[PDB]
Structure formats: structure tokens, C-alpha cells
Amino acid sequence: EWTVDKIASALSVLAEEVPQNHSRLVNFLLEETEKRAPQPRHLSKTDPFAHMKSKAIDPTMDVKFKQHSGEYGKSRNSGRRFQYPVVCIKPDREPVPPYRFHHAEIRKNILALNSRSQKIAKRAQAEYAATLAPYLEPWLRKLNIEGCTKSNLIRFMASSMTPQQKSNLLDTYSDDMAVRNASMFTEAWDRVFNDQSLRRVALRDILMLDKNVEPIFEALMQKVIDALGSYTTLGCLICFSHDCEHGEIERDNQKRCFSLEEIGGLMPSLRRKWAAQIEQRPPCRNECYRIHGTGNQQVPPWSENEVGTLEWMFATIGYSQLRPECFVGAILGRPCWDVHRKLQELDLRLPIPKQKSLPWYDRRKKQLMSDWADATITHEHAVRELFAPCHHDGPCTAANGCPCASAGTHPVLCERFCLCTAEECPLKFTGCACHSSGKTCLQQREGRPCICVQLNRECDPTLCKGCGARERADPENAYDEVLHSTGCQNVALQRGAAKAVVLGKSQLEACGYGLFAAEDIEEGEFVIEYTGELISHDEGVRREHRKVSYLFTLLEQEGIWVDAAIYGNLSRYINHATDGNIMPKIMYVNHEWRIKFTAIKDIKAGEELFFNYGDNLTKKMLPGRGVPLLVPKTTQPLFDPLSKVQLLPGQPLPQHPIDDSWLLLKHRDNLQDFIDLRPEEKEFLQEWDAFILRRHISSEQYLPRYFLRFVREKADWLVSKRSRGEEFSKLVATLLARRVLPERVVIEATQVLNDARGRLR
């Protein structure tokens, strides 16, 4: 009945629709625009220029006029020259110092990704594929050729893309094509639409962009591992967010997150909690199993996801002293005895080598000794390469291939995310011995030194007890002057809490901007942090090509840099001097490397801030730096960072809180662009991250408080949908496996969702 010639003949007749429709569309869009022309507004009552007569004369300037007439051209006379008085107006203001881009403030360093004849052809072809794509199905119905359906044409195409991708397509599509007229149609489509000379398309190019093609490119524990997969893969060990500023960006913009899958996934961490629980040797208000046993009535039939919830909660709560019955109950909305019976039916079942102490470090007395600075690189950040923390069964030795011990020229102390414990491992960091009725962790008066100060690290809110870092590294106590008068003193970055500073024109000849003190700063006080985009050496090179540079070397050997070109803080304006009044230092801050500025002299309000940029500037191979408030009185003009309004002394100092929603949104969209995640997954991950990124968590010490704020705030939202509570329990399981969530917090989360559901009922 059909042949290539006849389909090709038919397609040429149908293709005439395309220029017909385009003309109807364009004309329609133009007619609509004319009819909808704007009516002129804000017209004056009187002609404002009415009294102004010609300024001509037979400080002045000349104008020669010519008059024309006719179809072609045409000068009438030769022209007529005239003199006109000139009104000289001089501007009453100097422009502000120059810059490029809008300089936006960031609370902490953010992660940046890496940044012609073919371009034109591809674009011409893409635009053409876009216009023809909506005509394929209408044309296929009009033609009504047996077996010529879009699905069969895609089927034909997959029966030349990568071998794997052809199989993924064939998987969901099958080989049910016969009568494979899909051949004769393809041949005819390419003769008509793929003529070489532009704009052109092969049927495959249209098919490849189709919504159903383009995206298609022991036992209990295996279930639980797969179930918690997204949380272990993306959930951050530092800040607890699923799209954050932690992790590595590969040469292609693929990201290796700093997650549980960095620390060998779920199981090593889980096994260790179970072991810890064994060594360790209030009923719910939803028909508790502790009072109602197992029931005797009949329940609705449980779903796969419902048994899954009971499975991952059972596993992650482990050998506890907190029971899954209550929590799962409050998650699903089924009574407590109901899940206790399901658990009885399912019959679910759960699955120190003496090391020689180091002569350079004592973790018991919490101190360094006998030429420790030649035995380690823990404090030497500039020479430190970043590797994943410990995740091995044996001791932390070179012989056992421990990265902490063997990866560097010298060993490094085992940090909090290393799976080894303080008892089994001599390399483990344990914290501060430091305790005083006054100031400690300096910078130290009373007793032995501060091991943290020594190791170029800020104190750990969890490890540094009687410091009291716990309450001083809490951002909620940032402005508690009374609290900070007492011990530690080594939590500046965690506080932040920067000294009042003001932007202005630098005193340095033709330098542009400078940063000025807006408060008296004493010697050794924390001034400000250097924030920016975290970029690689290579990415930095690309930015240096396409006079003024904002790069700062963070981890030299590792090849990490901080670029404050667009994103950073006022510290980007601090100019160079061989002998400045401040100094940068690279600090280890809860598995983050951050730059802090410390005053090395007493600085007075109005005095400009200066520092030494280092090796890589004569105004007294990547080029970059390295190691009741009022507006002050100054010889230099000062400005608001955002508005650039010139400031005047004595005025209340501009102090604008950072709005990071623009940044929160980019993390929302980054998860929205993941194919590997289900929409039910993205709905929750985005909800949790939007919340947890706002709290800028660096230590697990504050997570239980924010977790509880999240339950209390989102309780109605969580109980209003089956997938939301399901996802939340996945998170809670992952966090319990890590030992990040105290039992009591989960017990309290049970009661929050239980009264939520009760109220909504």
C-alpha cells in the first residue's frame, strides 16, 4: 500500500503547514500587539518648553542646517550655519571608586562549579527540530500508516547512540514493532527534512528530544541500605544538608559529597553503633504497645513502603534501651500495637587491640610533646592534602594502610569523622584540657598550653569540655558579651561576631576601595573572616584571563582557593602593606578550613586596615593573597557597601543583615535538577535543606536543637502526606546510624507528630 516515494510525497504536502502556521502565528502576535498599544501617561497640563525661544545668533558652538524635498534626496540650498550660546554645567559629585559585578555578602564560603562555525549550525538545527517536533504526531495520525507511531519510530531508531543507551531505551520500549513501515517513513523523513546543503533534521534528532526518550539515557540490611541510599550519598557529615558548600567538584561538574558514602557508606558506621550499644549493657500517646500489647481487632493491609519504614527504623534504632513501635506508629499514623504486631509477624532480627601510644602526642592528658611539629602536619594546613577520613577495621597505622597515618609526608591526627575511637586509636583528636574561671584557649596564662591553639584549629563544641566552647561556638550566643568574657577565646569563626568595619576610598594612591576600622580594635582581637567562592587552581586560571584580583590561597598543596570577586565580605577590600595592622591565619574549623584576620596592633576607629599579601604591589603561578556604633571621623570618604551612598561621620553605622535566600534557592534548584531522586525525595530534601542551610551548622552539638525546631515547625506538613513522614524517617534512620541524634529527641519527635495528627483529625 505504501512506498518511500509516496510517504516523502505526502510529507512535502504536510510540511507546507509549517510556513502557513508560522505566518498565522506571527501575524496574530503582531495584530494583538497593535490593538494593545500603550496609552501615553503622565502627560503635563502645559507645554514645559513654551517660553523657550531659539538660541540662534548670526562660549558658543556652530550648527549648519540643510533643507530637503522630493522622492529622492535632496538638498534644496547649500545649507545655513548658526552660532548658539553654550550652557556649561559642571557635575557636583565624583563617581565612587570603580568595580566589576555586584559584590554580595556571604556568611560562609560557598562552592563554585567549573566554567565558532559548529555553534551556529547546531543552533540553526536545534531551532528547526523545535519547530518540527510538534508536527510529527498530527502527521502520523493524518497518514495513518500501519505501525507508524512515534513509539514504533523510537523503537525502530533503537533497533548511532552508545550501546548501553540503546538497551535502556529497548528495556522500557520492547521490540514490539510487522510490517516495519517505520523504515519507509524514516527514509522519507530524511529525504524531505534531512537534505544536505542548513536548516535540517533527521527523524532521530526529533525522537532523541522526545519527553519519553531524553530522560531514559544480609537480606534485611540490603533492603535498608538501598532505602537510605539518597541520605547516605548526599546528606552532609558537617552541615547535615543534601546540597551544600562541602564536597569536591570533579573536572566535569559532577560532585563527590562529604557524606556517609565517603566513610564507606552506612554499614561500617551502623555496625560500630550496634557494638557501642552492646558495650553500654514513658509510653507513647497513640495506643502504646507497652499498655495494649499487640492488639484483638483487624488492621488495614500494610504496604511495601510501610514495612520498609518498620525495617529501616528497626535496624537504625538497633540494640536500644527507644523502640521503633512508637516512632513508626507516629510516622505512618497506625496505632502503636498495630506496628508491634507487624514487627512480631515480620520476625525481624538484628545482625580493642592494644596500640602503642605516640611519643609526640598524648590524647589522655590532651597535650603535644617532644618535637611534635616535626612528627606531624596536622597544624601545617598549607602542605595538607585532603583525603576521606578513616573507614577501616584495623589499627590506624601505615602498615594497615590508614590514610591519616600514611597518605602524607607525616601522619595527621584522626578527626571526628574517622571511624576509629579515642580508646582504640592513638592518632585520635580528643579536645582541650583547658578550664579556668576566666579566659582560656589563648592565642595562655594559667597551666599547660591549648593543644587547639597549637594545632591551628578552633575548639570543638563537643570535644572541648569545660572550655566552654559548647556555649561560645553557639551562634545564638554570638552577642553575649558577658559569656565571652570567660574561657575560650578560640571559637571566633564559629561565633562571627566580627568587629565593626566601614568601606571607603583607600589612602593608598589610586587603590580604589579600602576597609576602615569602625571600632577600636585591641591587639590579638578577631577582626573578620575572608569569605569567597571555593575554586580549584585551574578554575582560578580561567578567571584570571577572562589589575584587580580577590583570590586567596586556602589550601596550597590541595589546590584550593577563595575568590571574593563577586561573593565574599568587606574583607575583600583590605589593601596590602609589608607591615599591616592585621594578619590572616588558616584555621581548621570542624573539618572546614577558614581564613581569619587577627589584629597585630591596636587599631583606632577610622584607621585603615592593612595586611601582607605575601610572595605573590609597590604602593605605600596563580597571583593571589596568602599567609551605639557610629560612622567614624576620617580624611577619606566612606560608603554604604550596597547603596554606595557617601557616609557622614556621627551617623548610625550601616549594619545590614545578610539575606542568603538567593543562595538557598540555588541549592533547591540543584536538587530539582537531579534525575536519580524521586519527586517525593526532592520535596522533603528541599524542605529539610531550606531549613538546615539557614542554621549554618558546623558541629553535631547543635543539630538536636534544630532537628527539634524542624519537627515542631513542619509537624502538620509532615503528617499531611504519607511520603513526607516516610522521607523524614529515612533521615532520622541515617542520623541515628551516625549517632548524631540522641534517643530522647526521637522520643520527643514521636509526641510532636502524634499531637499534630490528633489535632488534624
Binding site: E16, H22, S23, V26, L29, E31, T33, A37, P38, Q39, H42, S44, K45, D47, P48, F49, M52, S54, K55, M61, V63, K64, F65, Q67, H68, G73, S75, R76, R80, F82, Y84, V86, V87, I89, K90, P91, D92, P95, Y99, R100, F101, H102, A104, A130, T131, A133, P134, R199, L209, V213, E214, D640, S643, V645, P654, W662, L665, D669, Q672, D673
Partner: protein, 479 residues
């Protein structure tokens, strides 16, 4: 009756050389005069602002142009940008002027004094535009990469910067800023080859300590053109944009964009999450066969031949109620082009009627001009066998069939039809619309800007050598 009348060269003037390369970079007519008031315009050279008034005359030998003011920027900068504003107290005309040192000088043109200076930009300003919704709102596009929204209202006197369109919108110098008639949407473009659509928030009637910072455009693309974009404008909700080395003004549209829909918030904007993608949009429609729907559509291409490698060359549409839409543009080889957009649809209705009559009457079609006699009268002359189609009088001769031979009584030649399709056919998005009127100039002239009088009877083109060409339609000259 002469709604189809297109402009003709009436006057031309060379202003004294004031930069020693002297050129008029801008021309803008004052838009707040009462209806009937003589039009007043301002031509901005590198150092001066030449305020003219145009008066219709009966004498072909009389001069319609009178320079009612000539201001000189006595700063150390060179200017290229202008827009008109109003004093929010006295309703007196203000002329904003911007240049290479990054400031906006607002002049009290009637009193010959400086109103104020707007400081804040960190580079030279290439373009200025006033909000059609608020005469006190001004947008400035700069080398610093940002757009600054300023308010001349008394409320904002202390801090005039109401908004900064910054963040991740642009990476190089901006050459164009354009406002939507609703005053809520802004188009920006430049050297980075990106056209961005930004949605402005509502500005409080009170003091703003800091501007509202916008970080992401609601639509962003580098795919409409293949070079630096130096002119961008809205035509309703449609976009008109021009790029260097293309010899065209592209008419195109953002899929899913409508100003009838509620304005989206800042957090509704797409963010660059995938570095590969060169087009991103909040407006993108749900229904399409594509997994990644076409986010824009190329509609037509106005052919502006011989522009060369020149940039900072801008067009202008005359878009007013009860008058035809006229697009005017001047190239780099002494030529001024005009398109009467109202011709497209008339030609379109004509061609459809002609194809229909050709099919229904087996080619027996007689065409009669709309300038007498009547459709019913013509049918009465040729009888039932022949079909009659009415032609617009301006459509002069030389899947629609041409006459079999020259002496055939039905249809037109291929030459006639190809001439009409060159100028009026809109069926090909990558076609080339031939100007409806091309007026030559003497001798060498590169056009920088085009401006239309409120009543559309005057069209002023300004450019190199400090030259101004004045074109007029609906003249009163008694020859």
C-alpha cells in the same frame, strides 16, 4: 486618510565637532508634553546635549528645527546615554545624561541648571531608560555588569538607588536596558551575548536604606544571537533585539511570557545549576513533545543590510494608539530603513484570499485595488466564472501560483510575487524582511539612534560627525 504614509527627509544638520570621532550617540523626544504641543527632542553628543523643537511649516524652504538649548557637560567624561524625566514637585522636564565615568547627570533643561548627580555605578554607563509606569524611575546599564534602578521621587532623595539587577545575570559590559509598558519587566543585554528578562518588585513609597538586590533574571538566553547584543526592546510582550555582525533585527518571543499573568517573585527565577544550558526560563510552558521545551521562538528577521562589524547601533518602533506601528533603523552605509508593521497582516489577508480564490476558481482570479471599484461591483463585471480579490492600493506590482504567461489576464508574475514576499512574507523565521522604505543619505553615515515624535510625524536619526537627519510625514508644506 494617509495612514500608509511613510517618512521623507525634510531637514539635516551637522553640529560643531566637540571631541578631539565626534558622534551623536543618542536622540530622545520629550514624552510628557500635552497633546498637540510642538515636539521637543534632545540629541546627545560626547560633550553636549542639543535640545531642539520641531515645528510644521507651509514653506519647503523654511527651517522646522530650532535649538532651544545647548548644554555642555563640563566634567571630564564623554557621554552616550540619555532619557527624559520630570521634577516630582514642579513638573519641569529633566534630562538625564550618562557617560564613561559612571554617573547620571540630571539637568533642569528649562532653568539651565544641574538638578542632581546619581553616583553608585563602578564603570561607564552605556544606556538609560525611563519607566513607562513611573516617570521618576530610571534604569542604568553599565560596564560594571549591573543595572541600577533609580527613583527621582522625594521619598528616595537621600538614597536614590531602589534596585540592583546583579548576581548571576551578566558577565560583561551592558549595552542596552529596556522597560516593559507595565514598568515591572526589564530587558538587559551586552557583550556577554545574553538577553535577560528581570521582574522588578514593588518599590515602597518610603526611604530605602539599601536597594533591593535581584540576583537571577526570570528568563536568560545567549542563543537568540551569535554576537554581542547592542539593542533590546519590548514590542508588547514580544522582544526586538539586534546583535553585531548579523545584518538583522530579530522579532522573537519568550514561550509562556504574558504581562496579563501575575508578576513572579524573585525566588521564582531559574538559577544556573547546569553550566551547559545557555537558555533558562521561569515562563517555559508545560505542554510540548520536548523534555526540555522550546523556551523562546524566533518570529521574524528584519533585514538591515550593511552594518559590518559596527556596534552600538539602535532601532526604534513607533507604537501608539490609532496609528500604524513603524520600525525605523539606520545602518553603517548611509541608509535609513522603515517597516510599516500594519502592512504585514493586510498582505497576509490578501494572500489567503488569493490562494482561496485560486483553488475555488481553478486559477480564474481578478485582482482589484482598494482605491476605487467595489467587491460586489467587480463580481458583477467578470461574472460567476471569475473570482474577485481586493488588493491594498500600496501593494504595487512590477503556495500561490503566478500567471502562466505575461499576457495572462489572471494573476501576477513571479517577479511581482517575489518582490512582495521579500517585503511582507512572515512565514519564514530565518527569512529576511526587505525594508518597506530605504532612504539614502550623503555621504558616509553610521547611525547610532532613532527617535519618534509623540504624534509620529517626525523621525530623527543621529550618528557620526555629530549629524542629525530629520524625516517627516503628514507635512503642511504648500509646494
Amino acid at each position: 486618510s494617509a495612514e500608509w504614509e511613510l517618512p521623507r527627509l525634510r531637514t539635516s544638520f551637522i553640529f560643531q565637532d566637540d571631541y578631539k570621532l565626534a558622534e551623536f550617540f543618542d536622540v530622545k523626544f520629550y514624552p510628557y508634553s500635552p497633546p498637540g504641543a510642538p515636539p521637543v527632542f534632545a540629541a546627545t553628543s560626547k560633550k553636549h546635549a542639543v535640545i531642539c523643537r520641531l515645528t510644521q511649516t507651509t514653506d519647503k524652504d523654511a527651517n522646522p528645527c530650532e535649538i532651544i538649548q545647548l548644554i555642555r557637560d563640563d566634567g571630564n567624561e564623554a557621554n552616550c546615554a540619555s532619557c527624559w524625566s520630570k521634577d516630582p514637585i514642579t513638573d519641569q522636564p529633566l534630562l538625564c545624561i550618562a557617560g564613561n565615568e559612571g554617573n547620571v547627570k540630571v539637568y533642569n533643561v528649562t532653568e539651565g541648571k544641574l538638578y542632581r548627580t546619581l553616583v553608585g555605578h563602578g564603570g561607564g554607563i552605556n544606556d538609560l531608560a525611563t519607566s513607562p509606569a513611573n516617570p521618576y524611575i530610571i534604569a542604568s546599564a553599565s560596564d560594571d555588569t549591573t543595572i541600577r534602578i533609580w527613583s527621582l521621587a522625594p521619598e528616595h532623595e537621600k538614597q536614590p538607588c531602589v534596585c540592583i539587577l546583579g548576581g548571576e545575570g551578566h558577565s560583561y559590559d551592558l549595552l542596552s536596558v529596556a522597560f516593559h509598558d507595565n514598568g515591572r519587566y526589564v530587558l538587559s543585554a551586552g557583550h556577554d551575548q545574553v538577553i535577560n528578562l528581570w521582574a522588578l518588585p514593588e518599590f515602597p513609597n518610603e526611604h530605602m536604606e539599601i536597594p533591593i538586590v535581584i540576583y537571577y533574571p526570570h528568563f536568560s538566553s545567549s542563543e537568540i544571537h551569535n554576537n554581542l547584543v547592542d539593542c533590546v526592546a519590548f514590542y508588547g510582550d514580544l522582544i526586538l533585539s539586534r546583535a553585531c555582525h548579523e545584518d538583522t533585527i530579530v522579532l522573537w518571543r519568550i514561550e509562556g511570557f504574558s504581562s496579563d499573568d501575575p508578576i513572579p517573585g524573585p525566588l521564582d527565577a531559574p538559577t544556573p545549576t547546569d553550566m551547559t544550558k545557555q537558555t533558562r526560563s521561569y515562563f517555559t510552558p508545560t505542554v510540548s513533545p520536548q523534555s526540555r521545551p522550546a523556551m523562546f521562538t524566533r518570529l521574524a528577521q528584519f533585514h538591515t543590510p550593511d552594518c559590518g562589524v559596527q556596534f552600538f547601533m539602535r532601532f526604534r518602533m513607533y507604537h501608539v494608539p490609532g496609528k500604524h506601528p513603524i520600525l525605523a533603523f539606520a545602518n553603517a552605509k548611509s541608509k535609513t530603513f522603515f517597516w510599516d508593521l500594519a502592512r504585514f497582516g493586510e498582505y497576509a489577508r490578501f494572500m489567503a484570499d488569493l490562494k482561496e480564490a485560486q483553488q475555488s476558481y481553478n486559477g480564474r482570479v481578478v485582482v482589484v485595488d482598494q482605491g476605487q471599484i467595489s467587491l460586489a461591483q467587480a463580481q458583477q463585471v467578470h461574472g460567476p466564472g471569475v473570482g474577485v480579490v481586493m488588493k491594498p492600493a500600496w501593494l504595487v506590482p512590477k503556495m500561490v501560483s503566478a500567471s502562466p504567461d505575461p499576457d495572462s489576464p489572471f494573476g501576477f508574475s513571479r517577479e511581482t510575487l517575489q518582490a512582495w514576499a521579500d517585503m511582507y512574507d512572515l512565514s519564514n523565521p530565518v527569512g529576511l524582511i526587505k525594508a518597506h522604505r530605504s532612504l539614502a543619505i550623503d555621504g558616509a553615515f553610521v547611525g547610532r539612534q532613532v527617535g519618534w515624535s509623540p504624534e509620529g510625524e517626525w523621525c530623527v536619526v543621529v550618528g557620526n560627525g555629530n549629524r542629525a537627519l530629520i524625516y517627516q510625514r503628514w507635512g503642511k508644506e504648500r509646494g
